[PDB]
């Protein structure tokens, strides 16, 4: 059988689900995108104090489709680099 392969795949689905919940905590709108405004609220819940331009710059570094906001796949790329 492939016991360890099956268990490791299941833990990958749990990791994605956990990121979906994290995404949801950023997307306090529920509109499916993370704006500068929403990202700013999360950053200040941590100790941080970025300018709106600095928040836009964080967005632009993972904005693959270029619409100026973060969707779930781009959020995954942003979390990849952080973790």
């Amino acid at each position: 059988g492939s016991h360890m392969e099956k268990l490791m795949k299941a833990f990958e689905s749990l990791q994605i689900f956990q990121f979906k919940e994290a995404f949801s905590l950023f997307d306090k709108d529920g509109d499916g995108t993370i704006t500068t405004k929403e990202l700013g609220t999360v950053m200040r819940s941590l100790g941080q104090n970025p300018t709106e331009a600095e928040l836009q710059d964080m967005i632009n570094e993972v904005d693959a489709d270029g619409n100026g906001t973060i969707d779930f796949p781009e959020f995954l790329t942003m979390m990849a680099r952080k973790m």
Partner: protein
Amino acid sequence: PVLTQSPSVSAAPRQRVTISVSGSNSNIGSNTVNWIQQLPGRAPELLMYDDDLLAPGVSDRFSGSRSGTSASLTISGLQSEDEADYYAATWDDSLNGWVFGGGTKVTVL
């Protein structure tokens, strides 16, 4: 949510509760189902995988099955510590990615 779960349920201790999920040929029809448990104020954790196996540490009061596009999680002797949100996960061959149910809450009386 690409998967649809049975509605939230209330039951008394020692009752049997079955949560169900319904998908399509390309997800549950072709891929094994995982179950995720989120206890109040805790992180979601893996509860079952490969349809019918318990994740390490999980109570054997849990059992799972998969048939066609349906899967189910049974809690045989319901206890207070089972009060939680339960989510189904699987792979979707048509979307080439993980898909999830919208969750089912179990409340114990």
